[PDB]
Amino acid sequence: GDVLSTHLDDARRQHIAEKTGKILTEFLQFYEDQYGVALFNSMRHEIEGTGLPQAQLLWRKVPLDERIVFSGNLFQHQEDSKKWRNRFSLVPHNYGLVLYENKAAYERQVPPRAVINSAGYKILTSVDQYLELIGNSLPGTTAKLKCPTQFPLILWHPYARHYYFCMMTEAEQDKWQAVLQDCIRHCNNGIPEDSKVEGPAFTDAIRMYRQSKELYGTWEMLCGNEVQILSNLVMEELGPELKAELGPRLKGKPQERQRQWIQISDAVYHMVYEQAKARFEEVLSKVQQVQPAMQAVIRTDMDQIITSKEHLASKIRAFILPKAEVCVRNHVQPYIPSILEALMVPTSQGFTEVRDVFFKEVTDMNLNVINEGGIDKLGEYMEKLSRLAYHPLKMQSCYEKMESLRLDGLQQRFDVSSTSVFKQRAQIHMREQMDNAVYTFETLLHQELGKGPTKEELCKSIQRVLERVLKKYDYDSSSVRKRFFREALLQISIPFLLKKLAPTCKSELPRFQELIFEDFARFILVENTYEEVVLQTVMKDILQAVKEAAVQR
Torsion of CA 265, 267, 268, 269, to 10 degrees: 80
Q: Would you say 74 and 103 are in contact if contact means Cβ atoms under 8 Å apart? A: no
CB neighbour list of residue 224: distance below 8 Å, 6 or more residues apart: 117, 119, 120, 187, 188, 190, 232
Q: Which of 494, 474, 496 is nearest to 542 (CA)?
A: 494
Coil/strand/helix, residue 75: strand
Q: Would you say 520 and 528 are in contact if contact means Cβ atoms under 8 Å apart? A: no
Task: Tell me the residue type at 281.
Answer: E
The resolution, in Å, is 1.8
For 23-96, strand residue ranges (E) read 70-77, 84-91
Solved with? X-ray
Q: How far is Cα 26 from Cα 548, in angstroms, rounded to an integer? A: 43
CB contact burial 203-229 (16+ within 10 A = b; e otherwise): bbbbbbbbbeeeebbbbbbbbbbbbbb
Q: How far is Cα 277 from Cα 226, in angstroms, rounded to an integer? A: 8
Q: Which of 155, 3, 519, 30 is nearest to 304 (CA)?
A: 519
Query: How many Cα atoms occupy the beta-carbon half-sphere of 297 within 13 Å?
Result: 17
Coil/strand/helix, residue 100: strand
Q: Would you say 516 and 33 are in contact if contact means Cβ atoms under 8 Å apart? A: no
User: Cα separations (Å) of 420 from 218, 425, 431, 477, 486?
Assistant: 10, 9, 17, 21, 17
Q: How far is Cα 355 from Cα 149, in angstroms, rounded to an integer? A: 38
Q: Would you say 240 and 215 are in contact if contact means Cβ atoms under 8 Å apart? A: no
Q: What is the DSSP string of 106-158?
A: HHTTPPPSEEE--TT-EEESSHHHHHHHHTTSSTTTT-----SSSEEEEEE-S
Phi, psi (deg, nearest 5) at residue 154? -120, 135
Q: How far is Cα 370 from Cα 462, in angstroms, rounded to an integer? A: 11
The alpha carbons of the chain give a radius of gyration, in whole angstroms, of 26
CB neighbour list of residue 538: distance below 8 Å, 6 or more residues apart: 328, 332, 333, 489, 490, 493, 494, 497
Q: What share of the chain is helix, strand, coil (3-state, %, to 5)?
A: 65, 5, 25
Q: How far is Cα 56 from Cα 59, in angstroms, rounded to an integer? A: 9
Supply the DSSP symbol for 88: E
Q: What is the DSSP string of 386-434?
A: TTGGG-TTTTHHHHGGGGG---B-TTSSB-HHHHHHHHHHHHHHHHHHH
Distance of CA 189 to the CA centre of its chain: 4
**Other CB atoms closer than 10 Å to residue 383's CB: what's the count?**
12
Phi, psi (deg, nearest 5) at residue 109? 60, 40
Q: How far is Cα 456 from Cα 417, in angstroms, rounded to an integer? A: 54
Q: Which of 497, 171, 197, 460 is nearest to 323 (CA)?
A: 497
Task: Tell me the residue type at 1.
Answer: G
Q: How far is Cα 96 from Cα 114, in angstroms, rounded to an integer? A: 10
Phi, psi (deg, nearest 5) at residue 413? -140, 145
Q: What is the DSSP string of 208-245?
A: HHHHHTT--S--TT--SSHHHHHHHHHHHHHHHHHHHH
Q: Would you say 378 and 442 are in contact if contact means Cβ atoms under 8 Å apart? A: no
